[PDB]
Design a protein around this ligand. Structure first.
Ligand SMILES: N[C@@H](Cn1cc([N+](=O)[O-])c(=O)[nH]c1=O)C(=O)O
Ligand SMILES: N[C@@H](Cn1cc([N+](=O)[O-])c(=O)[nH]c1=O)C(=O)O
Ligand SMILES: N[C@@H](Cn1cc([N+](=O)[O-])c(=O)[nH]c1=O)C(=O)O
Lengths: 33, 299, 181, 48
C-alpha cells in the first residue's frame, strides 16, 4: 500500500480555484469602495 | 570413532556410528542425543527418553525496531510535503494581494501567520473556506494512511508453520545432507511434508548443507531468505548463542525422543531405565537442560 | 496581533500537536482492528508470586503427587500454598475443575496434563485456554505384564506407528478435526 | 468448509455425490467425509 498524489491533486485545484475566485472578489471591493 | 550417531548402510549392511560401536562390542553403553527410531530398536535396546523433542524451523535475524524517523515522511510523500508549502506560500501571497515597503513586511508576516492554519471580505473568505477544506482532506488522508501502515505491520504474520514454507518459494529451505531429518522428509507420505520434499529434491541452488554449523551460518547470512530445518533441541540452543540472530518458529513437525542405548541383552539395561525415570521424576533432567541451554545462555 | 515572534510558535506547535493526535488516533485504530489478545499468566512462576487468582489440581492421582514430592523451589512454593488453601483449591473430578475454572470469571486456574487441556480448549463454549509452557515432560505408553511376549512387538508397533505418523493424524482427528473451535 | 464446523454441510443421502466423498483419497475431501459421517444432526438429505 502506497498513497498517491492523484487524489491529492484534485484538491489543489479547488484551492487555487478558491484563490482565483478570491482575487476576483478582491478586485471588485476596491472598485466599489 | 567416525563421529556419527548411527544408521545402517544401504549397501554393505554395515551399521556405523555409536549404534555400530554398540553392536560390534566396542562400547558398553551410549549416552548421547540419539534419536529413538524404529530400525535402531531392532539392533539396540533403548530406555525411556530423557529428553523429548521434534523437527522444527529456523529463521534469520529480523531487524530490531525501529527506523521511526523515516516512517513520518513516508505516509505523506516527499513530493507532497513540498506542494503543501508551495500553495501555502501561494495562499499567503494571494491573501497578501487583498490587504510602503515595510507595510508589506508586516502584512506578509500577518498573512503568513494566518496561513499557519488553526471580516466578511468575500475575497479572502473563499480562501479561508477552500484552504481550510484543502487542509481537511489532507489531515484526513494522513490519518487514514497511518492507520493502514500500523495495520499492515500487525498483519505481516511471521513464517508460522511448515505449511507456510510450502506455500511459497521466495524463502529457500533445506535440511542436513544426512541424518534423521532428511530421512523423515524422504520416507514421509504426509501431504504437506511430501510437497516440501519434492521442492528440496529439485532445488537450485542446493538447499542442503553439510553440517549443523553450515546451516546456522547460511541462515545467518542470507538476509532472511533461507530456513534451516533441524531438531528442536539444537534449534532452541542456537537461539541462545551470540549474536542471538536465530529464532525457533512454530510448533515442531513430529515427536522424537533422546534415550540411553544399551546393546541387546545388557545387564546394565534395566537399571539405567529406572535411573532415567528416577532422574525424570526428581527433576534433575529438567534442571540440567535449563542449566546448559539457558543458565549459560548469552540471551 | 501579528507578532512574527510568537506567531510562528503558534503554527509550529499547532502542527506538532496535530501529528501527535493523528498518531494516537491511527494507532488506537490498530489495537481495535487487528486486535490480538494477551493472557496474564505466562508460567507457574506467575502463579507462585500472587494468590488473588486461586489454583489447584485434582484431589487424587499423578498431578497432585507431583507438587507434593516436588523439590523445585517454585512448585514447592505452590504446593505449600495449596496445602493450606482457604477455601480448598482441590477438586474431585476433571469435570469439576473445568467448570470451576469456567464459573470463576477468571479467578481459578486448573493444573492438569497437557493433553486434556488442549482438548477442553476445543470444546464449547470454548471459555478455556492453555497458557504457559508445561511444567514437566511425561508420556503415555502401552503397558504389558512383566515378561509378556506381547511386549517387544507392541513396542515395535508404536515406533512404526510414530514414524509412519499415524499418531499425529490420530491426535489431530480426535482433537482438532472434530474440535468445536 | 473443512476448516470450520459452525456452518453445517452435507450432500445427497444416495448417489454419485455421496459416493465421491466416501471414496475420496484427497486430503481436504476425505476430512469432509469424516465430518459428514458422524455429523449430528444428520447433514444428508433424501431429495434435492
Ligand atoms: N541425533 C539425530 C540425528 N540428527 C541430529 C541433529 N541435531 O543434532 O539436532 C540434526 O539436526 N539432524 C539429525 O539427523 C538422530 O539420532 O537421528
Ligand atoms: N494420566 C495420568 C492420570 N491423570 C490424567 C489427567 N488428565 O486426564 O489429563 C489428569 O489431569 N491427572 C492425572 O492424574 C496418569 O495415568 O498418571
Ligand atoms: N449425475 C449424478 C447424479 N446426481 C445428480 C445431481 N444433480 O441433480 O445435480 C446430484 O446432486 N447428485 C448426483 O449424484 C450421476 O449420474 O451419478
Amino acid at each position: 500500500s502506497a498513497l498517491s498524489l492523484s487524489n491529492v491533486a484534485g484538491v489543489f485545484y479547488i484551492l487555487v480555484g478558491g484563490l482565483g475566485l478570491a482575487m476576483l472578489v478582491a478586485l471588485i471591493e476596491f472598485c466599489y469602495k | 570413532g567416525d563421529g556419527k550417531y548411527g544408521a545402517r548402510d544401504a549397501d554393505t549392511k554395515i551399521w556405523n556410528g555409536m549404534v555400530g560401536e554398540l553392536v560390534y562390542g566396542k562400547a558398553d553403553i551410549a549416552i548421547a542425543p540419539l534419536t529413538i527410531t524404529l530400525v535402531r530398536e531392532e539392533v539396540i535396546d533403548f530406555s525411556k527418553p530423557f529428553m523429548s523433542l521434534g523437527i522444527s524451523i529456523m529463521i534469520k535475524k529480523p531487524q530490531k525496531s525501529k527506523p521511526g524517523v523515516f516512517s513520518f515522511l513516508d505516509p505523506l510523500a516527499y513530493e507532497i510535503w513540498m506542494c503543501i508549502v508551495f500553495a501555502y506560500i501561494g495562499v499567503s501571497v494571494v491573501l497578501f494581494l487583498v490587504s510602503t515597503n515595510e507595510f508589506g513586511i508586516f502584512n506578509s508576516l500577518w498573512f503568513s501567520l494566518g496561513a499557519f492554519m488553526q471580516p466578511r471580505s468575500l475575497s479572502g473568505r473563499i480562501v479561508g473556506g477552500v484552504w481550510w477544506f484543502f487542509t481537511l482532506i489532507i489531515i484526513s488522508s494522513y490519518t487514514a494512511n497511518l492507520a493502514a501502515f500500523l495495520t499492515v505491520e500487525r498483519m505481516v504474520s511471521p513464517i508460522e508453520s511448515a505449511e507456510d514454507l510450502s506455500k511459497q518459494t521466495e524463502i529457500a529451505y533445506g535440511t542436513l545432507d544426512s541424518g534423521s531429518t532428511k530421512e523423515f522428509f524422504r520416507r514421509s507420505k504426509i501431504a504437506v511434508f511430501d510437497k516440501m520434499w519434492t521442492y528440496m529434491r529439485s532445488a537450485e541452488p542446493s538447499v542442503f548443507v553439510r553440517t549443523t554449523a553450515e546451516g546456522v551460518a547460511r541462515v545467518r547470512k542470507s538476509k532472511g531468505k533461507y530456513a534451516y530445518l533441524l531438531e528442536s533441541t539444537m534449534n532452541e540452543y542456537i537461539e541462545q548463542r551470540k549474536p542471538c540472530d536465530t529464532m525457533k518458529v512454530g510448533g515442531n513437525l513430529d515427536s522424537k525422543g533422546y534415550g540411553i542405548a544399551t546393546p541387546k541383552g545388557s545387564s546394565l539395561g534395566t537399571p539405567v531405565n529406572l535411573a532415567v525415570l528416577k532422574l525424570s521424576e526428581q527433576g534433575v533432567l529438567d534442571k540440567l537442560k535449563n542449566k546448559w541451554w539457558y543458565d549459560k545462555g548469552e540471551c
